[PDB]
Amino acid sequence: MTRGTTDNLIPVYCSILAAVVVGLVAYIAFKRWNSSKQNKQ
Amino acid sequence: MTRGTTDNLIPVYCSILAAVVVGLVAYIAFKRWNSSKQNKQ
């Protein structure tokens, strides 16, 4: 619940990283699925 | 480069977490876009 009682701060790397990762995969996944084919992943 | 010579170990929480997060958002995003509408995000 407290997670180190940092209240959004300490976990800056895991937060910024996870964000870029999620969004990134979404930008490519949502784009590739927008119309692009798979052709053997 | 070595990061403790553990080769993917310490960052088990950030790894497992980021994974579930990314995939999750993808399962909902890829599903909602599969046909579901937005109607004001």
Q: What does this protein structure show overall?
A:
Chains A, B: It comes from Rattus norvegicus (Rat). Chains A, B: The chain crosses the membrane at residues 11-31. Chains A, B: It is found in: Cell membrane; Cytoplasm; Perikaryon; Cell projection, Growth cone. Chains A, B: This is Tumor necrosis factor receptor superfamily member 16. The structure is a homodimer of 41-residue chains. With 41 residues, chain A is mainly alpha-helical. Chain A has one domain (1-41): Single alpha-helices involved in coiled-coils or other helix-helix interfaces (Helix non-globular), CATH 6.10.250.1780. Chain A contains one helix and no strands. In chain A, 0% of the residues are buried. The A-B interface holds A 13-14, 17-18, 21-22, 25-26, 29-30, 33 and B 13-14, 17-18, 21-22, 25-26, 29-30, 33.
Structure summarized in a few sentences:
Chains A, B: It is found in: Cell membrane; Cytoplasm; Perikaryon; Cell projection, Growth cone. Two copies of one chain form a homodimer. Chain A is mainly alpha-helical and 41 residues long.
CATH topology of chain A: Single alpha-helices involved in coiled-coils or other helix-helix interfaces
Strand content of chain A: under 5%
Order of helices and strands of chain A: H
| Fraction of residues in helix of chain A | 40-55%
Q: Please identify the top-level CATH class of chain A.
A: Special
Please tell me the total number of domains of chain A. 1
Largest interface, chains and sizes: A-B, 11 and 11 residues
Quote the distance from N terminus to C terminus of chain A.
39 Å
Q: Tell me the quaternary state.
A: homodimer
Number of discrete helical segments of chain A: 1
SS-based class of chain A: mainly alpha
Give the overall form of chain A: rod-shaped
Taking all Cα atoms into account, the compactness measure Rg of chain A is: 16 Å
What is the annotated CATH architecture of chain A? Answer: Helix non-globular
Largest sheet of chain A: none
Total beta strand runs of chain A:
0
Protein name (chains A, B): Tumor necrosis factor receptor superfamily member 16
Subcellular location (chains A, B): Cell membrane; Cytoplasm; Perikaryon; Cell projection, Growth cone
PDB class: membrane protein
Keywords: dimer, transmembrane, p75, membrane protein
